[PDB]
């Protein structure tokens, strides 16, 4: 599934990522935005053959089991494929594991790289809260 901006905010915010961790919404709505465009289905490979999944690009060397990525962990307890689902619950779960891990948001390059430091509050103005 494509989220809409407003859509996927008020998705978040249910899953209770609005300030987890001191994270406020608009920073995972912008990194969902430079990571996946929204899209559930996005897949993208690394040159040391893990693989990134969903809406958040979570990556299979760590996270997730998708079974070719050898000598891998899987901390989030799932295959890699739930991570596609047009339901984020299980994309949600992972990623509050992950920026809990000690790095916070910078364990996501886009989030670094094109969130960090702007007005993420853009990414909720005019949205139903
Ligand atoms: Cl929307
Ligand atoms: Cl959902
Ligand atoms: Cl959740
Ligand atoms: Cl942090
Ligand atoms: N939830
Ligand atoms: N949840
Ligand atoms: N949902
Ligand atoms: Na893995
Ligand atoms: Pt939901
Ligand atoms: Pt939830």
Redesign the pocket.
């Known amino acids: 599934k494509v989220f809409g901006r407003c859509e996927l905010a008020a998705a978040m915010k ?3 990522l609005d300030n987890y961790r001191g994270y406020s919404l608009g920073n995972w709505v912008c990194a969902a935005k430079f990571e996946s465009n929204f899209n559930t289905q996005a897949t993208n490979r690394n040159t040391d053959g893990s693989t990134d999944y969903g809406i958040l690009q979570i990556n299979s060397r760590w996270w997730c089991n998708d079974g070719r990525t050898p000598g891998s962990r899987n901390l989030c307890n799932i295959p890699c494929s739930a991570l596609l689902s047009s339901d984020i ?1 299980a994309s949600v779960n992972c990623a509050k594991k992950i920026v809990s891990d000690g790095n916070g948001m910078n364990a996501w390059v886009a989030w670094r790289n094109r969130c960090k430091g702007t007005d993420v509050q853009a990414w909720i103005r005019g949205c139903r809260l």
């Open positions: 249910r899953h209770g619950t």
